[PDB]
Nucleic acid binder design. Structure first.
Ligand SMILES: [Mg+2]
Ligand SMILES: [Mg+2]
Ligand SMILES: [Mg+2]
Ligand SMILES: [Mg+2]
Ligand SMILES: [Mg+2]
Ligand SMILES: [Mg+2]
Ligand SMILES: [Mg+2]
Ligand SMILES: [Mg+2]
Ligand SMILES: [Mg+2]
Ligand SMILES: [Mg+2]
Ligand SMILES: [Mg+2]
Ligand SMILES: [Mg+2]
Ligand SMILES: [Mg+2]
Ligand SMILES: [Mg+2]
Ligand SMILES: [Mg+2]
Ligand SMILES: [Mg+2]
Ligand SMILES: [Mg+2]
Ligand SMILES: [Mg+2]
Ligand SMILES: [Mg+2]
Ligand SMILES: [Mg+2]
Ligand SMILES: [Mg+2]
Ligand SMILES: [Mg+2]
Ligand SMILES: [Mg+2]
Ligand SMILES: [Mg+2]
Ligand SMILES: [Mg+2]
Ligand SMILES: [Mg+2]
Ligand SMILES: [Mg+2]
Ligand SMILES: [Mg+2]
Ligand SMILES: [Mg+2]
Ligand SMILES: [Mg+2]
Ligand SMILES: [Mg+2]
Ligand SMILES: [Mg+2]
Ligand SMILES: [Mg+2]
Ligand SMILES: [Mg+2]
Ligand SMILES: [Mg+2]
Ligand SMILES: [Mg+2]
Ligand SMILES: [Mg+2]
Ligand SMILES: [Mg+2]
Ligand SMILES: [Mg+2]
Ligand SMILES: [Mg+2]
Ligand SMILES: [Mg+2]
Ligand SMILES: [Mg+2]
Ligand SMILES: [Mg+2]
Ligand SMILES: [Mg+2]
Ligand SMILES: [Mg+2]
Ligand SMILES: [Mg+2]
Ligand SMILES: [Mg+2]
Ligand SMILES: [Mg+2]
Ligand SMILES: [Mg+2]
Ligand SMILES: [Mg+2]
Ligand SMILES: [Mg+2]
Ligand SMILES: [Mg+2]
Ligand SMILES: [Mg+2]
Ligand SMILES: [Mg+2]
Ligand SMILES: [Mg+2]
Ligand SMILES: [Mg+2]
Ligand SMILES: [Mg+2]
Ligand SMILES: [Mg+2]
Ligand SMILES: [Mg+2]
Ligand SMILES: [Mg+2]
Ligand SMILES: [Mg+2]
Ligand SMILES: [Mg+2]
Ligand SMILES: [Mg+2]
Ligand SMILES: [Mg+2]
Ligand SMILES: [Mg+2]
Ligand SMILES: [Mg+2]
Ligand SMILES: [Mg+2]
Ligand SMILES: [Mg+2]
Ligand SMILES: [Mg+2]
Ligand SMILES: [Mg+2]
Ligand SMILES: [Mg+2]
Ligand SMILES: [Mg+2]
Ligand SMILES: [Mg+2]
Ligand SMILES: [Mg+2]
Ligand SMILES: [Mg+2]
Ligand SMILES: [Mg+2]
Ligand SMILES: [Mg+2]
Ligand SMILES: [Mg+2]
Ligand SMILES: [Mg+2]
Ligand SMILES: [Mg+2]
Ligand SMILES: [Mg+2]
Ligand SMILES: [Mg+2]
Ligand SMILES: [Mg+2]
Ligand SMILES: [Mg+2]
Ligand SMILES: [Mg+2]
Ligand SMILES: [Mg+2]
Ligand SMILES: [Mg+2]
Ligand SMILES: [Mg+2]
Ligand SMILES: [Mg+2]
Ligand SMILES: [Mg+2]
Ligand SMILES: [Mg+2]
Ligand SMILES: [Mg+2]
Ligand SMILES: [Mg+2]
Ligand SMILES: [Mg+2]
Ligand SMILES: [Mg+2]
Length: 247
RNA sequence: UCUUGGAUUUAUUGAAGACUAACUACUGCGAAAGCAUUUGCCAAGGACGUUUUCAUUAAUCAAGAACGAAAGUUAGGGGAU
RNA sequence: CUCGUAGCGGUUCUGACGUGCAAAUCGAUCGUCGAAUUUGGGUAUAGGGGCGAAAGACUAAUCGAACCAUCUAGUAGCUG
RNA sequence: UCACCUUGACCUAUUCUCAAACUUUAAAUAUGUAAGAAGUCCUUGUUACUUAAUUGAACGUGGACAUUUGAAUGAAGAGC
RNA sequence: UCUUGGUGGUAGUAGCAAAUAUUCAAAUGAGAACUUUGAAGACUGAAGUGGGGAAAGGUUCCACGUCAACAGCAGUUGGACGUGGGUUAGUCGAUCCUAAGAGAUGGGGAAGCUCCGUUUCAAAGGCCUGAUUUUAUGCAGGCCACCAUCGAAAGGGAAUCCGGUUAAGAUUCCGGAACCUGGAUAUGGAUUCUUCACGGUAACGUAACUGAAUGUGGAGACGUCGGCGCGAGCCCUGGGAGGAGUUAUCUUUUCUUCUUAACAGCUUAUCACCCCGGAAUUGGUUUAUCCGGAGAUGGGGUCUUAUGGCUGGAAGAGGCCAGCACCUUUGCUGGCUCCGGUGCGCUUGUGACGGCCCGUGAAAAUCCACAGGAAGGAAUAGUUUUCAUGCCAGGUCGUACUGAUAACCGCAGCAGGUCUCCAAGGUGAACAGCCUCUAGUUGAUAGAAUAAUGUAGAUAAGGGAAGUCGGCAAAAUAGAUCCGUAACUUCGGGAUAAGGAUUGGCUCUAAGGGUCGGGUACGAUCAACUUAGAACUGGUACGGACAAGGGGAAUCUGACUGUCUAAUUAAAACAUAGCAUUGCGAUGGUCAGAAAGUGAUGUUGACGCAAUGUGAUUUCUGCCCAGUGCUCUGAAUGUCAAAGUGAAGAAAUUCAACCAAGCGCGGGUAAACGGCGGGAGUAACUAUGACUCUCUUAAGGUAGCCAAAUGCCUCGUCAUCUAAUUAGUGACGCGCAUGAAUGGAUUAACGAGAUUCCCACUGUCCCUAUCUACUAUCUAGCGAAACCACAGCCAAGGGAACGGGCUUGGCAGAAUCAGCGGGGAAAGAAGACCCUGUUGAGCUUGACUCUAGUUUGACAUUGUGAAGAGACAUAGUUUCUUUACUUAUUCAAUGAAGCGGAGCUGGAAUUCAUUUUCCACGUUCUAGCAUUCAAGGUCCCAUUCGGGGCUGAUCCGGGUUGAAGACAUUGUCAGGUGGGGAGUUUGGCUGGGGCGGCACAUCUGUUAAACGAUAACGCAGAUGUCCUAAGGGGGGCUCAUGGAGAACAGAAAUCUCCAGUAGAACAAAAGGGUAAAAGCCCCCUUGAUUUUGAUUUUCAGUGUGAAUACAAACCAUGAAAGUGUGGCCUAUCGAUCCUUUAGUCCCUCGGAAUUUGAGGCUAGAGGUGCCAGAAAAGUUACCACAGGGAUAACUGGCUUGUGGCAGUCAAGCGUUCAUAGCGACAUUGCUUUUUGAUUCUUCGAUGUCGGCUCUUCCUAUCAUACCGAAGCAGAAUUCGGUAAGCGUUGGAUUGUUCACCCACUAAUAGGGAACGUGAGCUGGGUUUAGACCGUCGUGAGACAGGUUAGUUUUACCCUACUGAUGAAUGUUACCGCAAUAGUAAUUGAACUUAGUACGAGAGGAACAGUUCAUUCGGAUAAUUGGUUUUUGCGGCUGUCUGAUCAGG
């Protein structure tokens, strides 16, 4: 008869993002006349590390078209982008790694990252370390493009949506083992309070639907409907098949 | 088992990975295991030719090493048959 | 990582004490001691709620549901 | 044996022993009613009941009988 | 156990015992253990008992006066009491900045208190003018796109130091010496006829050396560890100038002073950089291997000023002395204050590096610089001066003190807790322990004595775990050097494995450094502590105190480090990395919120986030989709709500069709929940059973493992371990009930985890003794509490069954002291177990009823066109179908910046004399720059040295832009889902409750004892039906059965007679009843009918059911008398409310009617079986409350099935012979220690088993003493008597009592004492809360199943006991007596008797006598051992007193 840990996370008290040391919001450059009819030239000045993020951040500096001043955008760095590199964003831009072009104006099989789901929302797809997006199709009348997402799914996005050529840098990170609870401690120190995890079967029945009994056992089926609510969605939510993938 | 929710067939267009028929032989190369679509680059190899050059530098070899079908092992990728 | 101080804990004596020095101490013996360490201040989360490396533990000596006031002189086939 | 010492039960007359859910009989104790005036007797009045029929039935008028008026003991007042 | 207040006994009692410790004298005083001073002894021992601070306190600080209360003794003292004094800032903080966050406004939500949000969807605004005469500087240009405010006395930050001063303030006052900010402002210097400096190749330099808007850059501004370098301070030390100490002797000796601030000038640097040069024969170089043609080495330079040196500050101050004054105002005078060395030292700061990260380690205020060139400006210095000097001001608040064994919190002057800075010498590795210096304290009620029992510390002969549940506690080990070091292993470890030597002192030896140097075959000089070796030496001591690992072989278990039940559970539980599963591509997953123009994840984006499971590595994860969950573009007349449609009706209404989700159907999923079998026969053994035959499966437990922490039986069986093992280990396995991510098996290392063994070791024990300190005791002072009906000597009896009192006995003499744990079923706590309650709570679910949320349908928002297998058959915008518009709505973005359309060219437009037609719009080697309405061009001005347009830069539409679109979304309603959340329910009787049953509503016979009534979970049975006849009537007939007779035919077919009192039948149990019937056969029928009363039984003379007699009818029936109101009689059944039906066509619908419709009256039905009648699933070991001995266990008491022990009788056994010794079939008793029955007492609690310890009692006698009997020759036995005097063991396993074995013994008898004995212990067993396993349940949970951990309180009161005093007897003293009470010894062996008696032999005694021993007891200390504060003597370490001696 007590609210469970998965419910308490939505109140957002001790379960927020530890966001002091982060370098900003890693977004694309705001879609304007420079990036819609020609291009604009940037410059990388730093490849910095983002706290809580496994991918480096490239600080790319552009000139403001309308006022004499410099605008520093923060990109997710692509593997191969270096400091001192000129970076081109726009429609008429050239395909190099780190250039920002619409999905329509890049050919089939192009490998892109920081890809907008809608034109101008400043980067939503292929942002974690190592991941990328492959363009697998085009429908030039009623401009759309078919992609493969990092999950393996197929998405249809506007051809006016943008992307950055290359993979997101920092790949192969999760292939290293953490080896100890300490290295898990400092990974989640700079993300959010989701660590450690107590098993619900290791509890009292007031705390979890899995807890209690004279032996640690689940009692009911762990697969719960999508048509259930909070407090019952403690287990496998809306599972199609369970266990190993052996047919 | 699939099938009137149109299977099987047929046509158009795509993807994926694998494979490289026919030509293909009492034919070739490779130390052996093995090796076939093209073009490019890389270093190599046999045989021939030689009025070149060195002039026994060689033969086989314990111990020791390189390579070693396929299945298998570990971890990524890929999963068309 | 280890031996071991400061520190931080609390194994055993089932030691002392048990109208105590103390509503949890004292002593010896112990765990650990460069990190998932220890800690001050600021700050956030509030009661059927929080918080929980999970013991129904902790949330002002109060916790299988805090504390305060009211409804309330709640009701009692039960005891005085 | 192919009417026989070595037949079983059955029938008839005997015999020993018994019965809470057997009995011809049958106590003790306990128990119902009666021992009168709201009585008995005579005459005959009523009725739609009853009879073949004032016959019966029931309730009566009038008349006969007075405390040994219908066993014993008691009664402390009786009844409501 | 009332309330409030007061008061006692206990009681002058318990006690005032941690933190080494006090002592002498004087002073003050009424009074001194405690005050003050001196002396002495000591301690904290620099991670302090020392100097400061943060929080908190608040005056506690300081002085004077004072001692009533407070300082648990005292008090002249005080943190007390009374009166006062005291806190000084431009520089230290606050103030300011932002952090995590908090929070207004605009705006949205909410009935509202108010909520969200912090830049949002807002018309959110101040900044300078170049510089002043029409300026209160605007009535002007020009610029800026953010958007409150709060948030740190530890973060960021402008600037102050030294000396002195107070009773108490100080980085604040005073004296001296600075600095910063803000403002104003003059002079000098600088620069200027080249108008905004010069020098250097350069790095850069300087005293200056204009610089607007705008932009850019830097600082503020950052982790941790390691080593190295450098600095400061400290420590160590040499020479000298003073002062003090010791001085028998020694000591050029021991201690001590010898200082230099902020600020300023000049110099000072690793790193970095510049020039020259051009490198392999590669060089440079760090402790640490980096660097160099992208230019090393080298030679010259440049810069940062951490930091150091010099000088100013500043010797005038501070220190140390000396001399002279000597109520001198109170000083005056004078000298010295100097020069070094050393370093793996300590603390700290810094610099250059290196290591680490799936961790890469704040922000803002603020300040500066540069880019740019706006504007302004030149005479002998026009401007401008970030150069020097000069002037003024710096507010408000805080400041004292403590910061804790007395200033804070803990009730308080509480051994507790509470953040931080500084940190001397020695020993030593050390911030350890031990001793000392500076500083500080010497506070804690005392004195005397040295009983017991304690607490704390010790030691112990011989043995060495025999102790105990268990090695608990203790001992042992310990530092360092050298040697040596296994199994196993994840190859990193194990590991300090195990083991084994050495260690002092003194005198030496040998290595190991720095600075100094060459010709266009060389040693002066200084300094450090490591290491190795040698000799000599000694009561063979030496890590001499201190400090400091015990180790080994196994098993279980968790990989490890880590975490938790504060205050009983530290673990095997939790976590963990690793592994795996699941969901989600943002209009999203998971979750918030009452809503929201609302939130978390999210400053996010599948290498992510969320939800779970398992838990490192090795090696594996078998079989199951039937169940239930989950899931599926799956089947579409099975079910399908609301809305909508249609039919009938006057209509309310009734019906029908259509019918979304969801359910049902089909499938997939087990690292989802979960599951993983019998009977029988078979191999040339007897059973065993590869294979085989069936029953049911979805699958029938695979790989593995095991009496395992999982196995009841079980202490399984074997082996091993031991003398002996219910332990352990290894095997085996039909395994009650093992098993694969509810993970199976194994696994190095780790572990305050659990278990067994071994070595060492020891007082754990045999078996106890001694010592010290503190208590206790006694004294002065001070002085509680628990508890208390009244109390306090027993035996027996009875009694609510264990009496202090009552009864009958025993007896009994003041007042007491120390102990003590028998008793007071002592106290502590209105039992926490069990029961009762129509008492609650928590958690679970296939209980009931809801509910948020979610899903599905409908209507509104919701408009505009189409095509329309979209109306019913010249027939119509809505209709069981799709896509077209944008303006509602929705999403998103931006400083709403470039949208839409139209306009120049050139063509593979082969211009088709037409853009039917389309395409490109100033930027891509490179880490530069991009700003001033834009220069140019053009035209105008009224031209003023400047100003304005246009074009540069196409025109038009004012639609910011992109999606999405009348669908989501939203409002309302309807169906589903919905233990996530809520509330409620879970009967009773009961030889306690649970379970079973119904004795819960009934019937017959018995119980039941001759009217009636009468209990038990008494007994034997039956009831919830059956019947249109098995009801009613009439007539006829006799039934069960037996005997004899009939072909098949018998023992049983039909037929016939005789006998048949019922021995048959009557629906169903049993009892009763019945023979021209009540039965059997036949005929007719519905009385099993209507209406109202009366009555009987159960009984309240209520109801219900059943029944009896009538009466009014109407029928049946029979010839009729009659009979029939269901069954031959005794059982077979049901209220109010609601619904329904029959009847009358009756009453009413209240303004009056008609018609439906509704309501009403009388009689039935539908039902409550718990049967006088609620609508209801579990568990609780987390439980709780009101009670209850109305109630379970332990004890006592009764009873005595059972257990044991006896007896009578004697068929028989005992070679004959009942009774030497036995004894059947019977029979009569005893015990309460075994086990069973009462719930008698106890629930405002009698502390629950075993053990240990210790006492007493019984006798039903094992031994010992003395005897009797024998089938007693002897020896040894057996049976029996008197007898409880005296003994009655040590161990392995087990928590066990019991058991069992080993072994000794004279013997290892049995019992009682609240199953003797917990204020005597222990806590192993059992009995809370943690945890794991097995079985069972969907689960919560359960198990008189296993395993691990889990606080044991109080005596000082009375009595009892043990010891100790004592009034009274004329006083006093010595010597005695003995009533009464207690009593104590015990047992064995050997020699001799004696190889004798006896015996055929084998064997083989006893009495007397001597000598020893066992167990016990009482002493005693010559000896032997133990003990040591004799601190007696000696030795040793470390430190301290200068050394020595002598000591602490
Ligand atoms: Mg976990
Ligand atoms: Mg738990
Ligand atoms: Mg080919
Ligand atoms: Mg460690
Ligand atoms: Mg350790
Ligand atoms: Mg420690
Ligand atoms: Mg503990
Ligand atoms: Mg204790
Ligand atoms: Mg350590
Ligand atoms: Mg601390
Ligand atoms: Mg809640
Ligand atoms: Mg629990
Ligand atoms: Mg409360
Ligand atoms: Mg009350
Ligand atoms: Mg009877
Ligand atoms: Mg009678
Ligand atoms: Mg009192
Ligand atoms: Mg006393
Ligand atoms: Mg004393
Ligand atoms: Mg000391
Ligand atoms: Mg006092
Ligand atoms: Mg006094
Ligand atoms: Mg004072
Ligand atoms: Mg300051
Ligand atoms: Mg502020
Ligand atoms: Mg900081
Ligand atoms: Mg000063
Ligand atoms: Mg001048
Ligand atoms: Mg100059
Ligand atoms: Mg700067
Ligand atoms: Mg200063
Ligand atoms: Mg420090
Ligand atoms: Mg100046
Ligand atoms: Mg002050
Ligand atoms: Mg002060
Ligand atoms: Mg102070
Ligand atoms: Mg005090
Ligand atoms: Mg020292
Ligand atoms: Mg030393
Ligand atoms: Mg003391
Ligand atoms: Mg000894
Ligand atoms: Mg000895
Ligand atoms: Mg023993
Ligand atoms: Mg021990
Ligand atoms: Mg060594
Ligand atoms: Mg060793
Ligand atoms: Mg070992
Ligand atoms: Mg562990
Ligand atoms: Mg575990
Ligand atoms: Mg494991
Ligand atoms: Mg640990
Ligand atoms: Mg605890
Ligand atoms: Mg957020
Ligand atoms: Mg499995
Ligand atoms: Mg409907
Ligand atoms: Mg043992
Ligand atoms: Mg075993
Ligand atoms: Mg075996
Ligand atoms: Mg087994
Ligand atoms: Mg004493
Ligand atoms: Mg009395
Ligand atoms: Mg008597
Ligand atoms: Mg009493
Ligand atoms: Mg009396
Ligand atoms: Mg009497
Ligand atoms: Mg007596
Ligand atoms: Mg006395
Ligand atoms: Mg005592
Ligand atoms: Mg007692
Ligand atoms: Mg008690
Ligand atoms: Mg009741
Ligand atoms: Mg815009
Ligand atoms: Mg009777
Ligand atoms: Mg019967
Ligand atoms: Mg019945
Ligand atoms: Mg008849
Ligand atoms: Mg019958
Ligand atoms: Mg009968
Ligand atoms: Mg009845
Ligand atoms: Mg009712
Ligand atoms: Mg009306
Ligand atoms: Mg009843
Ligand atoms: Mg009571
Ligand atoms: Mg006797
Ligand atoms: Mg005897
Ligand atoms: Mg005898
Ligand atoms: Mg006796
Ligand atoms: Mg005796
Ligand atoms: Mg005995
Ligand atoms: Mg007992
Ligand atoms: Mg006792
Ligand atoms: Mg225990
Ligand atoms: Mg006790
Ligand atoms: Mg006492
Ligand atoms: Mg001596």
């Amino acid at each position: 008869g007590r609210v469970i840990r998965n419910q308490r996370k939505g109140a957002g008290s001790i379960f927020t993002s530890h966001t002091r040391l982060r370098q900003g919001a890693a977004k694309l450059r705001t879609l304007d006349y420079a990036e819609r009819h020609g291009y604009i030239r940037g410059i990388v000045k730093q490849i910095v590390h983002d706290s809580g993020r496994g991918a480096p951040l490239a600080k790319v500096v552009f000139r403001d078209p309308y006022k004499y001043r410099l605008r520093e955008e923060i990109f997710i760095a692509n593997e191969g982008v270096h400091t001192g590199q000129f970076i081109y964003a726009g429609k008429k831009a050239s395909l190099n790694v780190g250039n920002v072009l619409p999905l329509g104006s890049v050919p089939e099989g192009t490998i892109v990252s920081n890809v907008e789901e809608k034109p101008g929302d400043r980067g939503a797809l292929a942002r974690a370390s190592g991941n990328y997006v492959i363009i697998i199709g085009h429908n030039p009348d009623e401009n759309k493009t078919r992609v493969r997402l990092p999950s393996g799914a197929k998405k249809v996005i506007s051809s006016d949506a943008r992307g950055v050529i290359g993979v997101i840098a920092g790949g192969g990170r999760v292939d290293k083992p953490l080896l100890k609870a300490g290295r898990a401690f400092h990974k989640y120190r700079l993300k959010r309070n989701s660590w450690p995890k107590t098993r619900g079967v290791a509890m009292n029945p007031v705390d979890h639907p899995h807890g209690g009994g004279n032996h640690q056992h689940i009692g009911k089926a762990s697969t719960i409907s999508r048509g259930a609510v909070s407090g019952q969605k403690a287990g496998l939510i809306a599972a199609r098949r369970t266990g190993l993938l052996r047919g």
